[PDB]
Design a protein around this motif. Structure first.
Motif, short mmCIF file in Angstrom:
data_model
loop_
_atom_site.label_atom_id
_atom_site.label_comp_id
_atom_site.label_asym_id
_atom_site.label_seq_id
_atom_site.Cartn_x
_atom_site.Cartn_y
_atom_site.Cartn_z
N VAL A 1 0.98 -3.10 10.40
CA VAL A 1 0.49 -3.81 9.22
C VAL A 1 1.55 -4.21 8.23
N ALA A 2 2.74 -3.60 8.33
CA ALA A 2 3.78 -3.80 7.33
C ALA A 2 4.95 -4.52 7.92
N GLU A 3 5.56 -5.43 7.15
CA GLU A 3 6.78 -6.11 7.58
C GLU A 3 7.99 -5.28 7.16
N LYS A 4 7.81 -4.41 6.15
CA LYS A 4 8.90 -3.58 5.67
C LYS A 4 8.24 -2.28 5.23
N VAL A 5 8.92 -1.17 5.50
CA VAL A 5 8.45 0.16 5.06
C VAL A 5 9.60 0.79 4.31
N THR A 6 9.30 1.38 3.16
CA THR A 6 10.26 2.18 2.40
C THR A 6 9.66 3.60 2.30
N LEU B 1 0.88 -1.19 0.00
CA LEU B 1 0.00 0.00 0.00
C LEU B 1 0.91 1.23 0.00
N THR B 2 0.77 2.12 -1.00
CA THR B 2 1.66 3.25 -1.13
C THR B 2 0.87 4.50 -0.88
N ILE B 3 1.45 5.39 -0.09
CA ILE B 3 0.76 6.63 0.20
C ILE B 3 1.75 7.67 -0.34
N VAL B 4 1.31 8.53 -1.28
CA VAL B 4 2.19 9.51 -1.89
C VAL B 4 1.64 10.89 -1.55
N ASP B 5 2.52 11.82 -1.17
CA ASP B 5 2.03 13.21 -1.00
C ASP B 5 2.97 14.12 -1.71
N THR B 6 2.52 15.35 -2.05
CA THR B 6 3.40 16.29 -2.70
C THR B 6 3.69 17.37 -1.68
N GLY B 7 3.98 16.91 -0.45
CA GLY B 7 4.38 17.83 0.61
C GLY B 7 5.83 18.31 0.44
N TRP C 1 14.67 5.65 2.27
CA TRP C 1 14.87 5.09 3.60
C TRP C 1 14.10 3.80 3.62
N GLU C 2 14.66 2.78 4.27
CA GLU C 2 13.94 1.52 4.40
C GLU C 2 14.29 0.79 5.68
N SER C 3 13.29 0.12 6.23
CA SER C 3 13.52 -0.77 7.38
C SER C 3 12.53 -1.89 7.47
N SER C 4 13.04 -3.05 7.90
CA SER C 4 12.18 -4.17 8.24
C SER C 4 12.26 -4.37 9.72
N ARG D 1 8.41 16.38 -5.90
CA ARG D 1 8.69 16.86 -4.55
C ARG D 1 7.70 16.10 -3.70
N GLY D 2 8.10 15.70 -2.51
CA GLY D 2 7.09 15.08 -1.65
C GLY D 2 7.63 13.77 -1.12
N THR D 3 6.74 12.92 -0.61
CA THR D 3 7.17 11.71 0.08
C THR D 3 6.21 10.60 -0.30
N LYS D 4 6.78 9.44 -0.55
CA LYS D 4 6.02 8.27 -0.89
C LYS D 4 6.37 7.23 0.17
N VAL D 5 5.35 6.70 0.84
CA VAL D 5 5.60 5.67 1.83
C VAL D 5 5.07 4.38 1.24
N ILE D 6 5.92 3.34 1.19
CA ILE D 6 5.48 2.06 0.60
C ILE D 6 5.42 1.07 1.73
N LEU D 7 4.23 0.58 2.05
CA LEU D 7 4.07 -0.42 3.09
C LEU D 7 4.02 -1.80 2.47
N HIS D 8 5.00 -2.66 2.82
CA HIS D 8 4.99 -4.02 2.29
C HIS D 8 4.21 -4.77 3.32
N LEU D 9 2.95 -5.09 3.01
CA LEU D 9 2.08 -5.56 4.08
C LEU D 9 2.39 -6.99 4.51
N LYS D 10 2.16 -7.23 5.79
CA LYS D 10 2.18 -8.58 6.36
C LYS D 10 1.12 -9.43 5.70
N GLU D 11 1.34 -10.73 5.64
CA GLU D 11 0.39 -11.55 4.84
C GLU D 11 -1.00 -11.57 5.43
N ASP D 12 -1.14 -11.36 6.73
CA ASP D 12 -2.49 -11.33 7.31
C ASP D 12 -3.17 -9.93 7.30
#
Ligand SMILES: CN1CCC(NC(=O)c2cc(-c3c(O)cc(O)cc3Oc3ccc([N+](=O)[O-])cc3)on2)CC1
Length: 214
Positions: free
Chosen positions: A133-138, A78-84, A151-154, A171-182
């Motif tokens: 909800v995420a096992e990894k976030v970028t 699930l990716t959340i993008v903003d032009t902040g 930036w990334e972390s598991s 310009r802005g920030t995109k957060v990519i949530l690599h979701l857990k399987e459940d």
């Protein structure tokens, strides 16, 4: 062959503890993770909005101030993008893990004692709700003053930062949530709309949900 430099950083100790608590404990009401992302996006959009009032050129890198939600059922992201306003490299290193946050201890104690996870935003550590909800976030980000960075972390106590060689963002920030399987319910259009309606009704920027045709 391309060469890319990576820097690995340890989380500040209490932040690492909080991440382990969030990851390894069951909580109900995990849906509030999205409220926290949209709230952080709204704050970043406020920052560029205000900066642009005096300096309209800060919008050279994109005039539209908005938030996009992009569920992807193929790669379970699930990716959340903003032009902040975006973050510089130093901002990522400082603001996403190495600098202690004053609310981390209070929050861990609250949670331990049965506070609802929804309380996390109040403690200034709402970003870390992504790990419900995420096992990894970028986090990919682009500030007018810097290059685009990722930036990334598991979790597990470290994160990495590198120059982003992916698709340029204006310009802005995109957060990519690599979701857990459940946690795949958060890729469903109805569920996303439900939780935006329940928790994110007074965002003063347009939010658009992009749904891949089925
Ligand atoms: C000097 N720097 C300071 C930082 C300024 N940038 C931002 O504030 C910013 C935030 C975001 C930003 C965003 O647009 C969406 C998010 O989901 C998270 C963000 O960053 C945050 C990082 C950490 C925390 N936290 O842990 O409290 C909160 C939000 O994008 N740009 C740019 C100028």
């Amino acid at each position: 062959m391309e060469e890319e430099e990576v820097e690995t950083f340890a989380f500040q100790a209490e932040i690492a503890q909080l991440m382990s608590l969030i990851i390894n404990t069951f909580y109900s009401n995990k849906e509030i993770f999205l409220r926290e992302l949209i709230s952080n996006s709204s704050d970043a959009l406020d920052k560029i909005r205000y900066e642009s009032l005096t300096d309209p050129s800060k919008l050279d890198s994109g005039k539209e101030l908005h938030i996009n939600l992009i569920p992807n059922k193929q790669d379970r992201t699930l990716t959340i993008v903003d032009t902040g306003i975006g973050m510089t490299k130093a901002d990522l290193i400082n603001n996403l893990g190495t600098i202690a946050k004053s609310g981390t201890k209070a929050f861990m104690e609250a949670l331990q004692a049965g506070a609802d996870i929804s309380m996390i935003g109040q403690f200034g550590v709402g970003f870390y709700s992504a790990y419900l909800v995420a096992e990894k976030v970028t986090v990919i980000t682009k500030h007018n003053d810097d290059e685009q960075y990722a930036w990334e972390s598991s979790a597990g106590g470290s994160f990495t930062v590198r120059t982003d060689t992916g698709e340029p963002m204006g310009r802005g920030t995109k957060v990519i949530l690599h979701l857990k399987e459940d946690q795949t319910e958060y890729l469903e259009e109805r569920r996303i709309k439900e939780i935006v309606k329940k928790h994110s009704q007074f965002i003063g920027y347009p939010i658009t949900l992009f749904v891949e045709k089925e």
